[PDB]
Design an enzyme around this catalytic site. Structure first.
Site, mmCIF file in Angstrom:
data_model
loop_
_atom_site.group_PDB
_atom_site.id
_atom_site.type_symbol
_atom_site.label_atom_id
_atom_site.label_comp_id
_atom_site.label_asym_id
_atom_site.label_seq_id
_atom_site.Cartn_x
_atom_site.Cartn_y
_atom_site.Cartn_z
ATOM 1 N N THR A 95 1.011 -1.303 0.169
ATOM 2 C CA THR A 95 0.015 0.201 -0.296
ATOM 3 C C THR A 95 0.921 1.096 0.043
ATOM 4 O O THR A 95 0.280 2.143 -0.215
ATOM 5 C CB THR A 95 -0.883 -0.221 1.783
ATOM 6 O OG1 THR A 95 -2.007 -1.011 0.856
ATOM 7 C CG2 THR A 95 -1.702 1.038 1.553
ATOM 8 N N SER A 163 -11.546 -1.767 -9.029
ATOM 9 C CA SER A 163 -10.130 -1.628 -8.109
ATOM 10 C C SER A 163 -9.846 -0.576 -7.417
ATOM 11 O O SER A 163 -9.455 0.545 -7.222
ATOM 12 C CB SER A 163 -9.350 -1.668 -9.443
ATOM 13 O OG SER A 163 -7.753 -2.212 -8.781
ATOM 14 N N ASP A 299 -9.637 -9.389 1.890
ATOM 15 C CA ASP A 299 -8.266 -9.839 3.225
ATOM 16 C C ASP A 299 -8.358 -10.945 3.946
ATOM 17 O O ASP A 299 -7.818 -11.401 4.926
ATOM 18 C CB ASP A 299 -7.615 -8.294 4.042
ATOM 19 C CG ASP A 299 -6.798 -9.226 4.217
ATOM 20 O OD1 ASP A 299 -5.327 -9.374 3.940
ATOM 21 O OD2 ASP A 299 -6.639 -8.452 5.396
#
Length: 408
Positions: A95, A163, A299
């Protein structure tokens, strides 16, 4: 090695560690705002602190009070970032490397982004940044990335065929592009960037952002990480006599995927600029379901598969990114070892609920996988052994609520 023993019931109240995505964006945006911002509930993990170090290398004034999970950030203004004396080490944070790319493409200096991340390529963010006027060198291994700052970026309209990573990166570049930058996508995606932009007084149009605005400081509390919450939520769900309350967990619709799916299975989950809430969970019996594909991007998904393992009926999803497809495979392997009839599908997965057994599983050195099998350990007829930072904190919290996990 991590061992478990069947839980006699989870109980109590706990806070989960702060949201990682929001922590990332809160410190980065605060760093360039005008004025002083105090950040509460900042995830003091390695990744989040790698972002703090990179920003400090560029002239950002940020105090780290690690024990209290607080940052006192003294913003340097939209034009106050300075050339770093060395490469920015993003460590293990995919990230950080993505957001910094977006933030740095349009600065008037060069940067190198370094890190541990090479399995994840980033042509999806480089292509559009390049259309805005970015000159990025991403040959060979990536990381490292070389960014040749272009202080004259221009706004663009870009089409994204679901996305949020790309959208976040482009909103950041848009703060430093002349004109308007517009991102259109088939359906909504995580919007933490949009929210924190609004928190720091930048205006948006819903999404387009314009280069030329000014982030203003504004204190913020990071909500608990619903992704972490999810493991306790499932633990409580599948373990007889459990009743727990997770305080101040963020409940942003774009992140509620797992909660939505558990609710469909019959979980008892009471949900009392970022929506935050208290979540109370009580033991409940689940049925299997057909998982709608649009719920996966919202996740933690691995632990949902545990919930599926202990339900009555078959759980199925048909029709994904590779990273998750890999994680699924790891869950199918592990479940197989604990007596669960699981099976991978080219388009998704098929799990037949039954009875977890004690045994050994491979975590593939993935904390989310190890966590998911720790949760299974609560109901597993016998000890579950795992061959797996944040997991030691996960261990301390788990044990405090009756989820037994011994790293021995």
């Amino acid at each position: 090695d991590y061992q478990t023993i069947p839980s006699q019931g989870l109980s109590g109240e706990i806070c989960v560690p702060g949201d990682k995505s929001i922590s990332h964006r809160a410190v980065l945006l605060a760093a360039i705002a005008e004025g002083q911002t105090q950040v509460d509930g900042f995830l003091m993990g390695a990744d989040n602190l790698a972002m703090v170090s990179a920003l400090q290398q560029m002239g950002a004034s940020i105090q780290v009070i690690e024990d209290e999970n607080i940052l006192v950030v003294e913003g340097v203004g939209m034009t106050g970032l300075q050339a770093p004396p060395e490469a920015l080490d993003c460590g293990n944070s995919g990230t950080a490397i993505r957001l910094l790319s977006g933030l740095l493409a349009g600065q008037p200096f060069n940067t190198v982004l370094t890190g541990d991340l090479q399995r994840r390529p980033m042509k999806r963010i480089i292509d559009p940044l390049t259309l805005m006027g970015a000159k990025i060198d991403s040959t060979g291994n990536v990381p490292p990335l070389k960014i040749y700052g272009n202080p004259r970026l221009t706004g663009i309209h870009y089409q994204l065929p679901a996305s949020a990573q790309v959208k976040s990166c482009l909103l950041l570049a848009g703060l430093y592009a002349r004109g308007k930058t517009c991102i259109t996508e088939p359906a909504p995606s995580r919007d933490h960037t949009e929210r924190l932009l609004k928190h720091f007084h930048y205006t948006l149009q819903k999404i387009c952002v314009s280069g030329g605005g000014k982030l203003k400081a504004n204190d913020i509390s990071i909500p608990g990480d619903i992704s972490s919450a999810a493991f306790f939520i499932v633990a409580a769900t599948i373990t007889p006599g459990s009743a727990i309350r997770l305080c101040r967990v963020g409940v942003n619709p774009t992140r509620l995927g797992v909660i939505n799916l558990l609710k469909m299975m019959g979980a008892d989950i009471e949900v009392t600029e970022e929506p935050t809430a208290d979540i109370t969970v009580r033991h409940a019996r689940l049925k299997g379901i057909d998982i709608p594909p649009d719920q996966v991007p919202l996740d933690e998904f691995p632990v949902l598969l545990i919930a599926a393992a202990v339900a009555q009926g078959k759980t199925v999803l048909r029709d994904l990114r590779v990273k998750e497809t890999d994680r699924i495979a790891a869950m199918v392997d592990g479940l197989q070892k604990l007596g669960i009839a699981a099976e991978s599908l080219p388009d998704g997965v098929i799990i037949q609920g039954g009875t977890l057994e004690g045994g050994e599983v491979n975590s593939y050195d993935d904390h989310r996988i190890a966590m998911a099998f720790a949760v299974a350990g609560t109901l597993a007829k016998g000890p579950v052994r795992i061959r797996n930072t944040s997991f030691p904190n996960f261990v301390e919290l788990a044990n405090e609520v009756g989820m037994n996990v011994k790293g021995v």
